[PDB]
Amino acid sequence: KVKVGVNGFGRIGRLVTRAAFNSGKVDIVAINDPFIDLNYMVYMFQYDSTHGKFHGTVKAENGKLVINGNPITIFQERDPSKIKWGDAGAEYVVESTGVFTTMEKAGAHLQGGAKRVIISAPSADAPMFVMGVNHEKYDNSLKIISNASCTTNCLAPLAKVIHDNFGIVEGLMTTVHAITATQKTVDGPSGKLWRDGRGALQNIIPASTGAAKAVGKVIPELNGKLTGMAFRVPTANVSVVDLTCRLEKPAKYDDIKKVVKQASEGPLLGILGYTEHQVVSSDFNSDTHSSTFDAGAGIALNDHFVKLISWYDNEFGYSNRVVDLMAHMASKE
Amino acid sequence: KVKVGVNGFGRIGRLVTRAAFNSGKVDIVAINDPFIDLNYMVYMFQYDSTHGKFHGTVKAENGKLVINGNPITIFQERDPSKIKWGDAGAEYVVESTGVFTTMEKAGAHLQGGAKRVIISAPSADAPMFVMGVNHEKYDNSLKIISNASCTTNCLAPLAKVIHDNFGIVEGLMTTVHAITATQKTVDGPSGKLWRDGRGALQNIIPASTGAAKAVGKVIPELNGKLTGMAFRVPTANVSVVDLTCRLEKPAKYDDIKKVVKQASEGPLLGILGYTEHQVVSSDFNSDTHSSTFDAGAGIALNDHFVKLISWYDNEFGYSNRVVDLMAHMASKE
Ligand SMILES: NC(=O)c1ccc[n+]([C@@H]2O[C@H](COP(=O)([O-])OP(=O)(O)OC[C@H]3O[C@@H](n4cnc5c(N)ncnc54)[C@H](O)[C@@H]3O)[C@@H](O)[C@H]2O)c1
Ligand SMILES: NC(=O)c1ccc[n+]([C@@H]2O[C@H](COP(=O)([O-])OP(=O)(O)OC[C@H]3O[C@@H](n4cnc5c(N)ncnc54)[C@H](O)[C@@H]3O)[C@@H](O)[C@H]2O)c1
């Protein structure tokens, strides 16, 4: 129902757009990217190296992008305040360039005549929501919001289930992270974090991740009880989370399997998956879950100290959660 | 002897700098990069993911980069005309940003007080030299020159030897090319060539290459008798050239081995290598040859139609040829 605009036709822009048509839960009506011409948008959307060719039709027609006959207005504005979202009928705007992630910078879209803005990335100040965890806390007073880190979306559902059933005393998260577009193939220059500037093909690269601190925001009971770090490795797609955590109430590893499977079939259906199959990363390519619990891969030392493993498709799962969130926002309109 | 400045501390900047100290044939006295602070230069120079830690000492000391006690003036100028090369004593300037590759744009360095400029990349108009092939054609009248494509440096020495001994009627070159910094890990945006914008980890990517046309410039007899294309593949370093070519004078494949080995031991020593060992790409990591002929890997259909294979370290070989060229220019001063 709700008409949506997308600022930035990157991996996220394009895959959010894919999810919109794939699910039909919202309607893309407008796209802004100053660094991509319309003809190139057709190419970049149609062919995905990782998710394969688009299941549908896409063509350029009289300066509009036409996906399954649905025509889409294109803008080429460097400055977000000058996008005429209102004119094109864009109610909600997905901010997916990841350079306007503050309340202040993201707000520019409201000038164009957007009603609401969803930042497809963590925000320093804008409120963060993770579907299945704290999305019920959205109300219509919020004009600008964030859908958090892809990693945060994987970790929070699992964390919720564990904290609800046994209570997390304290936890430490490692994510093994497939490669992002903020990384380099060889070269050198990367202003602020030096490790991220190293060649991504060749090595395992440590990296920071506020994803653990951020779960503390969406599940406020867990505030300051989690932190973590990341290793970037050269797989094209699909990442994994390793939550090492202390429980207050004892839990045989079989009990943890039960409550997680239970949640996957019930309140967190389609968000938290569960599997006992002997899976590997690429088995999750184009999986729409936020988080899939690997029962086999996890290990427990005792009934109060366990390592839980959860797979997530960094691109596809999050992309679908952005759409799912907007759909929910539109229901509460 | 000659004092040298380097514009741009990229893969090429840094490895040219390495070769300067490693061989001691020139002396780096100045470095300009506006996008890298001095402390980060230390990091990026010291550690190479591919060639390993620098065999020597490097530290920042009072705003200077100090490599083996040799201190180096740092500049932070976006605009090349405003670099005070003369002040820092930089006689020759290595233009290694690859965005000032025209006579016109590269000329800016002369304003700073550089005497000569060497473009570490093909140029549209500036004269190109390949060591061992046409470097004798340099004279002091030339203020701005190019050291050609890394690929051109691999192809030309081989081509010379073959054309000198048997004559190339016509040839077609394929290069399988390790990844460059003009490629992407996943993302999307790449203005002009769409294929180069695709994910470099995941796939084999066709790409254009004027390297074959360019050999026609350095060996003028071969003008318009070669062309080719490239495939980019996800290896960190080391590329290979596949020259398919028609000979006018008959040549058993054993004759070709003989004349190439001969050249490698004699007039093209240290530029053209020869090997019969059953080698692979990574066996050429940090090899300083412009081109190493794989005797085993090549194949011949008949005495007039053969496929010749030659390995080159895209970074290290070329870096060393830049230094070797400047050294020669300085001898002719
Ligand atoms: N898998 C993931 O990468 C992942 C998962 C979760 C969250 N995120 C977050 O989502 C963000 C989006 O990154 P991406 O994956 O799309 O990479 P990307 O490089 O493909 O995306 C950037 C796109 O936006 C365009 N753009 C840049 N500046 C712009 C401007 N001022 N106006 C309009 N368009 C502009 C660029 O041309 C490019 O097409 C990141 O900040 C990241 O934190 C990413
Ligand atoms: N192996 C190879 O990549 C190879 C081989 C042969 C030739 N070449 C050629 O050499 C060139 C250099 O590329 P690279 O490999 O160093 O990649 P790179 O991205 O690491 O190099 C660019 C460097 O120059 C800096 N820079 C950019 N603009 C600048 C400016 N205006 N002033 C000063 N510094 C600036 C950047 O910060 C960066 O450090 C390319 O044009 C390429 O055609 C490359």
From Swiss-Prot, chains A, B:
The record marks 177 as: Activates thiol group during catalysis. D-glyceraldehyde 3-phosphate binds at residues 149-151, 180, 209-210, 232. InterPro entries: GlycerAld/Erythrose_P_DH, GlycerAld_3-P_DH_AS, GlycerAld_3-P_DH_cat, GlycerAld_3-P_DH_NAD(P)-bd, Glyceraldehyde-3-P_DH_1, NAD(P)-bd_dom_sf. One of its GO terms (biological process) is positive regulation of canonical NF-kappaB signal transduction. The modification Phosphothreonine is found at residues 73, 151, 175, 180, 182, 209, 227, 235. Changing residue 245 to S: Markedly reduced glycolytic activity. Forms free radical-induced aggregates, but to a lesser extent than wild-type protein. The keyword Glycoprotein applies. Glyceraldehyde-3-phosphate dehydrogenase activity is inhibited by fumarate, via the formation of S-(2-succinyl)cysteine residues. The modification S-nitrosocysteine is found at residues 150, 245. NAD(+) binds at residues 11-12, 33, 78, 120, 314. S-nitrosylation of Cys-150 leads to interaction with SIAH1, followed by translocation to the nucleus. S-nitrosylation of Cys-245 is induced by interferon-gamma and LDL(ox) implicating the iNOS-S100A8/9 transnitrosylase complex and seems to prevent interaction with phosphorylated RPL13A and to interfere with GAIT complex activity. ISGylated. Pfam families: Gp_dh_C (PF02800), Gp_dh_N (PF00044). Residues 1-146 are annotated as: Interaction with WARS1. Changing residue 150 to S: Markedly reduced glycolytic activity. Forms free radical-induced aggregates, but to a lesser extent than wild-type protein. Abolished interaction with TRAF2 and TRAF3. The [IL]-x-C-x-x-[DE] motif is a proposed target motif for cysteine S-nitrosylation mediated by the iNOS-S100A8/A9 transnitrosylase complex. Has both glyceraldehyde-3-phosphate dehydrogenase and nitrosylase activities, thereby playing a role in glycolysis and nuclear functions, respectively. Glyceraldehyde-3-phosphate dehydrogenase is a key enzyme in glycolysis that catalyzes the first step of the pathway by converting D-glyceraldehyde 3-phosphate (G3P) into 3-phospho-D-glyceroyl phosphate. Modulates the organization and assembly of the cytoskeleton. Facilitates the CHP1-dependent microtubule and membrane associations through its ability to stimulate the binding of CHP1 to microtubules. This is Glyceraldehyde-3-phosphate dehydrogenase. The lineage of its organism: Eukaryota, Metazoa, Chordata, Craniata, Vertebrata. The gene is GAPDH.
